[PDB]
Amino acid sequence: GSHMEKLMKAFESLQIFQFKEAFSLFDKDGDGTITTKELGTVMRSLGQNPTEAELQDMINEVDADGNGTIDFPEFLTMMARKM
Amino acid sequence: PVLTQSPSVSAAPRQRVTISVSGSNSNIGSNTVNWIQQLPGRAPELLMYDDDLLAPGVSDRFSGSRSGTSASLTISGLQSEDEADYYAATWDDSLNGWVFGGGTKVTVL
Numbered sequence: 514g515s516h517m518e519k520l521m522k523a524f525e526s527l528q529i530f531q532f533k534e535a536f537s538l539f540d541k542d543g544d545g546t547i548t549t550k551e552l553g554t555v556m557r558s559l560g561q562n563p564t565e566a567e568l569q570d571m572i573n574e575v576d577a578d579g580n581g582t583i584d585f586p587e588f589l590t591m592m593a594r595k596m
Numbered sequence: 597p598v599l600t601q602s603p604s605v606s607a608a609p610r611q612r613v614t615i616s617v618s619g620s621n622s623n624i625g626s627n628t629v630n631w632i633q634q635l636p637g638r639a640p641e642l643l644m645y646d647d648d649l650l651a652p653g654v655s656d657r658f659s660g661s662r663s664g665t666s667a668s669l670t671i672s673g674l675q676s677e678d679e680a681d682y683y684a685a686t687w688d689d690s691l692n693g694w695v696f697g698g699g700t701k702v703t704v705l
């Protein structure tokens with residue numbers, strides 16, 4: 514059988530689900546995108562104090578489709594680099 | 597949510613509760629189902645995988661099955677510590693990615 518392969522795949526689905534919940538905590542709108550405004554609220558819940566331009570710059574570094582906001586796949590790329 | 601779960605349920609201790617999920621040929625029809633448990637104020641954790649196996653540490657009061665596009669999680673002797681949100685996960689061959697149910701809450705009386 515492939516016991517360890519099956520268990521490791523299941524833990525990958527749990528990791529994605531956990532990121533979906535994290536995404537949801539950023540997307541306090543529920544509109545499916547993370548704006549500068551929403552990202553700013555999360556950053557200040559941590560100790561941080563970025564300018565709106567600095568928040569836009571964080572967005573632009575993972576904005577693959579270029580619409581100026583973060584969707585779930587781009588959020589995954591942003592979390593990849595952080596973790 | 598690409599998967600649809602049975603509605604939230606209330607039951608008394610020692611009752612049997614079955615949560616169900618319904619998908620399509622390309623997800624549950626072709627891929628094994630995982631179950632995720634989120635206890636109040638805790639992180640979601642893996643509860644079952646490969647349809648019918650318990651994740652390490654999980655109570656054997658849990659059992660799972662998969663048939664066609666349906667899967668189910670049974671809690672045989674319901675206890676207070678089972679009060680939680682339960683989510684189904686699987687792979688979707690048509691979307692080439694993980695898909696999830698919208699969750700089912702179990703409340704114990």
Ligand SMILES: [Ca+2]
Nearest residue numbers: 540542544546
């Ligand atoms: Ca939003």
Ligand SMILES: [Ca+2]
Nearest residue numbers: 576580582583
């Ligand atoms: Ca974008």
